[PDB]
Amino acid sequence: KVFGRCELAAAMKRHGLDNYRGYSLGNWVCAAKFESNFNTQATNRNTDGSTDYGILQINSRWWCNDGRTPGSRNLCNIPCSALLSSDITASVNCAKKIVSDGNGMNAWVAWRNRCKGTDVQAWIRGCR
Numbered sequence: 432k433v434f435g436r437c438e439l440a441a442a443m444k445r446h447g448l449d450n451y452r453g454y455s456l457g458n459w460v461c462a463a464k465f466e467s468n469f470n471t472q473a474t475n476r477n478t479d480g481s482t483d484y485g486i487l488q489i490n491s492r493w494w495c496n497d498g499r500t501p502g503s504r505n506l507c508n509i510p511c512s513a514l515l516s517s518d519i520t521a522s523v524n525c526a527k528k529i530v531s532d533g534n535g536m537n538a539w540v541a542w543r544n545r546c547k548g549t550d551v552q553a554w555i556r557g558c559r
């Protein structure tokens with residue numbers, strides 16, 4: 432599913448991301464825009480052999496099991512395919528574990544490089 436901007440904003444707010452660990456809703460929507468272009472089906476391979484999955488591009492090295500990342504952990508205890516569902520619950524639940532692990536949203540390279548320090552509330556401007 433390719434979400435609309437305001438459609439994703441509303442889904443992320445319903446699942447508890449608005450000001451989760453201090454990060455307003457626009458931070459998460461900006462993050463999803465540049466990680467996946469709002470596409471729950473997005474995948475991208477990493478040079479180390481891991482793969483990033485879903486609207487927030489969660490890495491199989493640490494967070495999900497895809498059966499092909501040697502020496503990996505599965506800290507969200509889920510298959511990486513669950514992060515590809517048109518239902519974003521698994522992705523959001525796992526994102527909360529990531530953003531709580533010490534580095535905040537700096538865990539997402541795209542957030543640090545394209546959202547951090549910008550006017551992220553523009554990503555939610557004009558939505559209900």
Ligand SMILES: [Cl-]
Binds near residue numbers: 496509510
């Ligand atoms: Cl599994």
Ligand SMILES: [Cl-]
Binds near residue numbers: 452453534535536
């Ligand atoms: Cl933080």
Ligand SMILES: [Cl-]
Binds near residue numbers: 553554
């Ligand atoms: Cl914008």
